[PDB]
């Protein structure tokens, strides 16, 4: 773990103009290339957290894929460590600012294909993201998706959280990322969030209005938790299915979203199985696009 110097970097702005906190957009004075810099460790005197930080850096160095943000170097200034990543030119929210009523069908296919490839690679290594959202789906000048801000390195948005996260189930796994992917499908097509809750309970209400009652395990976790004393989740006798909410979306798109958003985590597809879906396979999109990305 060679540490490099922060002296070669000059501040251009904050990445996202504050919406990400203290993540500095910087230029390398020697090469002209642009980076994102985030503080990683407050003090390397603390030998306990030091060891944990070095473990995480080792993972970041090994976890290399075309759809993951590139860690370039680790810098040390005094006792603090900073991670320096390749700066990626925009995010999917930038696309949606230009097109606030939704993106082009083929644009959605290309972005979801790459998100799935990136998450699938992580899953193949037993790495869960756990915090997928539009603000961490970066997009290069050439349209390559770069994922970032994995849940291994509040008023935090709950909009993409699966039911198992919302009730605090310790048995969550890879299926949380498939759920978040499902949330992205309608949002990229329609230009609005699927389930924009403002708390754990509100989020659950939004989910349940559409998708019905939770699995028994999850309802039990909710009902046994003292934090939710005095509050109940709704009985749903009449839900509002996705196709009623978005009657102009094709059946193929709705079907993909519905599979990802199964209320039972065990009945969601594996991330990699998503690429088998008609949404990607129709007209040979998938083979054609794969060959394109290589070439
Ligand atoms: N490496 C990298 N490039 C970018 N680019 C980017 C991000 C936001 C925006 S925006 N849409 O203008 O706020 C434009 C470009 N963000 N980025 C990182 S790692 N962003 C990031 C993040 F997405 C989440 C948490 C911490 C972070 F540092």
Author numbering: -4 to 148, 161 to 302
Study text:
The kinase domains of CDKL1, CDKL2, CDKL3, and CDKL5 were crystallized using a phosphomimetic Asp-X-Glu (DXE) substitution and in the presence of identified inhibitors.
CDKL2 co-crystallized in an inactive αC-out conformation with two inhibitors, CDK1/2 Inhibitor III and CHK1 inhibitor TCS2312. Their binding was stabilized by a collapsed P loop conformation that establishes potential allosteric sites for inhibitor design. This forced the αC helix to swing outward, breaking the salt bridge between the catalytic lysine (K33) and glutamate (E51, αC). Instead, CDKL2 and CDKL3 showed an unusual amphipathic helix, αJ, while the constructs for CDKL1 and CDKL5 were truncated and lacked this region. These results are consistent with the observed structures, and they further show the importance of the unprecedented αJ helix for CDKL2 and CDKL3 function.
